[PDB]
Symmetry: D2
Subunit: 392 residues, 4 copies
């Protein structure tokens, strides 16, 4: 098997099958035609191949898919118009009313919304567990329980779950495990190899790596992905990825290894820096010894990630000011671009709410999140340094 970046650059494509084009051409085209009609017949049946319409299949998309399936080690892949396109398409297909789904204690906000105000409102039962508490997960299992869905690492503190510990419990009761692997990418973590059934990415972030597209990827077994292709996508969301945008994603995937390597080194220096600063009460970075799941981290992820969460002594007012002072970093929700981003949920994403509500939904007053980019490290240090002083 070739190495990750050989595959992130070659897998699935031989130049010869398309006139020697080194870069595969872009199929920007809604429909495909048929030479006869019996031949058309046998593509709403599936013995001939060739795809029929761009909301089901497309070679540009199919290559993005095969390529991502190889990076995750899984059998098939599906591309969609966004992360949420991947998450919603997934669950709409796998769940019906009366099914229970078991959710990690904290989720990407729009995931939480899709659950508690979306599919949750159509007779599907929700329950939150701490996926790190294998005792407590077991306890919470039922036979109605059809799905376990978490992010590891998860917002806000980078709380991790033992993926293989969780698969074991799923194997025993007969439930399907879906891991949102956005933060890590296949380059760092690979849940299917630890017994997860599906993985979902917002390809909008690290995979594209250049903040210019919105996209998502499902990877798993042919059997399940085919279901998601043919029900969740075709019929239930219509989250279709543009062939233009899929080729952009494929282009940013060629440098994934190189970018992630730099994301993780930058982050580490920045983490170690932050821990030594007076204005900081708590830091959450997977690559610190101080991280409470440090061992689990090293076991499951090959590097500690580009993301840092940390908490400012003077609370929400101290984070308002830290955030306003940033000159090189940008204020934006989102992550995994070459440009360094930061957000202070207390006074951005979650503003009106007063403090108990913030805690109740697990969000500290002074908590900042950084997506550490590909900039020069002394430059980032300096922007953060001065912004810490401004926090006072």
């Amino acid at each position: 098997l070739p190495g990750f970046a050989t595959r992130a650059i070659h897998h699935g494509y031989d130049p010869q099958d398309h006139g020697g084009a080194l870069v595969p051409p872009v199929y920007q085209t809604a429909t495909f035609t048929f030479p006869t009609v019996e031949y058309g017949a046998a593509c709403f049946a599936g013995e001939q191949a060739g795809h029929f319409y761009s909301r089901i299949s497309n070679p540009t998309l199919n290559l993005l898919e095969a390529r991502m399936a190889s990076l995750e080690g899984g059998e098939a892949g599906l591309a969609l118009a966004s992360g949420m396109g991947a998450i919603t398409s997934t669950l709409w297909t796998l769940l019906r009313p009366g099914d229970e789904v078991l959710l990690g204690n904290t989720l990407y906000g729009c995931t939480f919304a899709f659950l508690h105000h979306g599919i949750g409102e159509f007779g599907v039962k929700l329950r939150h567990v701490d996926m790190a508490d294998l005792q407590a997960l077991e306890a919470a299992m039922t036979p109605a329980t059809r799905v376990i869905y978490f992010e590891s690492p998860a917002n806000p503190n980078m709380h991790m779950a033992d993926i293989a510990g969780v698969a074991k419990i799923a194997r025993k009761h007969g439930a399907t495990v879906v891991v949102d692997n956005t933060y890590c990418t296949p380059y760092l973590q690979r849940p299917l190899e630890l017994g997860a059934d599906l993985v979902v990415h917002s390809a909008t972030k690290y995979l594209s790596g250049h903040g210019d597209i919105t996209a998502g990827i499902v990877v798993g077994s042919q059997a399940l992905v085919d279901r998601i292709r043919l029900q969740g996508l075709k019929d239930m969301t219509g989250a279709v990825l543009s062939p233009h945008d899929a080729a952009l994603l494929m282009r940013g995937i060629k440098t994934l290894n190189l970018r992630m390597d730099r994301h993780c080194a930058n982050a580490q220096v920045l983490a170690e820096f932050l821990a030594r600063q007076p204005q900081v009460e708590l830091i959450h970075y997977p690559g610190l010894a101080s991280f409470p799941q440090y061992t689990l981290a090293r076991q499951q992820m090959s590097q500690p990630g580009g993301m840092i969460a940390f908490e400012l002594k003077g609370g929400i007012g101290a984070g308002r000011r830290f955030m306003n002072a940033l000159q090189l970093f940008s204020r934006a929700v989102s992550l995994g671009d070459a440009e360094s981003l930061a957000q202070h949920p207390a006074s951005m994403t979650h503003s009106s709410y007063t403090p108990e509500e913030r805690a109740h939904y697990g969000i500290s007053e002074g908590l900042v999140r950084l997506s550490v980019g590909l900039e020069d490290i002394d430059d980032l240090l300096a922007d953060v340094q001065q912004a810490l002083k401004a926090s006072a």
Copy 2:
């Protein structure tokens, strides 16, 4: 009030406001930054115009939306990654278990699937009612009924709906009337102007006009679209349209009027031609006097349209013979491309079936369906001429 063509080209944009750029610049960006947290706090409650994410707002996206709002004469618009993306994003937000949805008697296949196999399996009641029959409709109006949805003209026979009459009833019961106006486009039929509440399109078809993008649009009230944006799109579909594809869609719309005029002028020659032919048994062209609903159709459509359906003697065997013998028309599903397309569902989409089954879905054995392109008519004429000779 500027003309329809003026507006298709200019509505919502001034070059003086963007450095003098004649064509708007394309905002191929997944995220926007904030000047302060407080500015960004405002962006999640709602009170600061501009933008948060590409999944909610983006100027390229907004332009299209506004512009599509203006053509249909609606308060506000919304763009999504496909037709299905619009249909699902709308229905999802307007229905919850124990609600009902009344529907035309025949729907676009994937709309059908979604209803029966998707949302209708989470406890939403479905009923099919012939929407040209106000008696039959007012009858089905239980008090549960929350949404009335249909296509006019509708597959296969271009069956029309009394839009004004359906709206009257719905306004009476507090129902929302939702129209898929994909086939006409606002140049030819503005359902909101007949008391529709919402319209949806596959922009994949006529609006793009060029078979190179997949995309969808919703138009209607501020209140209904704010809802569909922030729940259906935001959490239940994740169907985000590429700003590149949004630009190419805008490009398309700049010739909707010229394109539709030729679509309609070609369609009508071929339809008149067909009517004088021995191999054709019956035709469904809105523009022929003998059309069962010639008069309701002119009330609602400025022109008879670009689609033709007809039935061949020799039934199914004839079809294949016809279909396979074309060399200008292409065999494909889809419609509203510059390229003329033909399909005969008995031996294509619904081939796996058997005639006894094909009765169930109202699909005749000799029904071929022309989407008439922009090519010189004499060529389209000759092509169809020899393909009928070959149907002996």
Copy 3:
């Protein structure tokens, strides 16, 4: 022989050939590979159809070029980065020091510049001649005369050349004739059918039709074109056309006929309105009976075009006032966009000069020039109308 519109849409491509894709895929690739070194040996002599590098050959560009050949009724077509690209690539190939070029009396500014300030300065001799005057042409030929280059109709007064007469005079001395056929497009005029050897285009204008690309075309004889490819393009300008932009261009070409009809019709009307107005000294529009060379116009052009020029009685000040009152028309150079455009060279392009220098060059103090767009005629009228009022 398939009609223009059928060719503009289909020529050079069969979906079957490329896995059914209705719209050919876009070859955004800079290099091409080889299966063996033997097949690699072939693409540096060239007795095979393939490619070696996008800067000499690429399928998307070739398709475009085939499609332009067919419409201009020529053997071979070349695609380039801009019209200037095509013009200079063409001339740099066919002229060497001591060679002479006869030119139309007036030319597009940068073409004039290229000649007088570029190539002319490398020992190429230049002579300007009126090309309706066949006696003066015959009398200006010298053995040094190698090329005859002109636009027709030509700025600023829409002055025609007698193309077929020229080509006859040219035949006598074996000289090559080159026609900037930008203004008419192969849809209105076909110089090669009137004996010219080569036509060039600024595809930036009518061919794109929508103002989003820069692009040039050469069409003519296989041997001439091959040399412009291999020398002008490859070695001397390197104005390589983006595959993306070539795709958008072919997208444009699909509605060329329809757009051209609307352009010409809007124009015809505006010219009638203009000719009869109190403020208007003079008017140059081909379609008016009073246009000097009306009879020749109609021998060459199937329609009078979308361009108008007129002179305001009150000179520079009227133009200056007339230009700023416009709300729908945009002030800008350029032409053939869907948006209507205007410019008053006297106070814009040639504003630096003083009055007697602009007469010395052929520029009236109230000459205004309109690119009649695709907007509603009544709206364009209203704009012009009020700007005419305001010019007093």
Copy 4:
């Protein structure tokens, strides 16, 4: 202190752009528009007259391009930038503006094929006098200066042998006699070498290669002083070539440059291992890579380039026919001519670009019989090793 220059990667990603000047957009919007409009007829008269800042036409100027230009400038350490449709675009546009008949251009000994062709079969034929000199030999260069010498042009490293030139040594000679020094800097990118900081007047790239890095666009760049870049803008490109870059492709090129440091660091690490490996293999008669001591101009290479590059050339034992066999056994390297892509590429000019020719004829255009050239891409080094190991075995 705030008068520190941001690091190279910071600038390759941020320079010249602030999201707040454009709606918060984190990525600049693409100005995919062929022309720009004026608020009054007066404001239009300024941008043809020089007075008020603004845009008239994308073939003269465009904000997407402008940002690309200001960014490449910063990276080369030049005053101004220009973006063109191709490498050759940049070069021809340059020389067509800098040279007239009777002017003399001094050229390095070897050149890129199309550049060689431009000069010998193009501008050379329009009354411009050419002379080739070993740019590595400053005595010989001083010796060739005339008062007619107007431009000194050369690549460094040079196609195809990566022959190096003393850039500083040249600009000093050129300062003395008064000439303009244009350096083709495609093979290094500004990340490894910056001729403008060593005294050159202008640099030109084929951005089609390393700057893009993903081999899907065609593009050129000129960087130099404001006046010379302006001239080239308004004479070479505007009137003489029309080599305008599509804003879409320019947006892609900026996307490429956001990773340039990383990619180059990986091309170079990869190439250094491959070269070391190659030197030790039996069939390899000789090898030419800047990062080995056996490189003739090893010290000047180190002097001038912060890393030895991604290009390797070497000669097999067995003449042409051993190449045929080697190249046709490559399963991961592609058979192509080009460089700077993430895909690794191998050309064997003997049996490819120069296949028409007969052995003898090669030696008098300069090319060995068993000469393979390599653009080492970004693949995993261990796959690239294995590919070359097994291909050598077939070339036995």
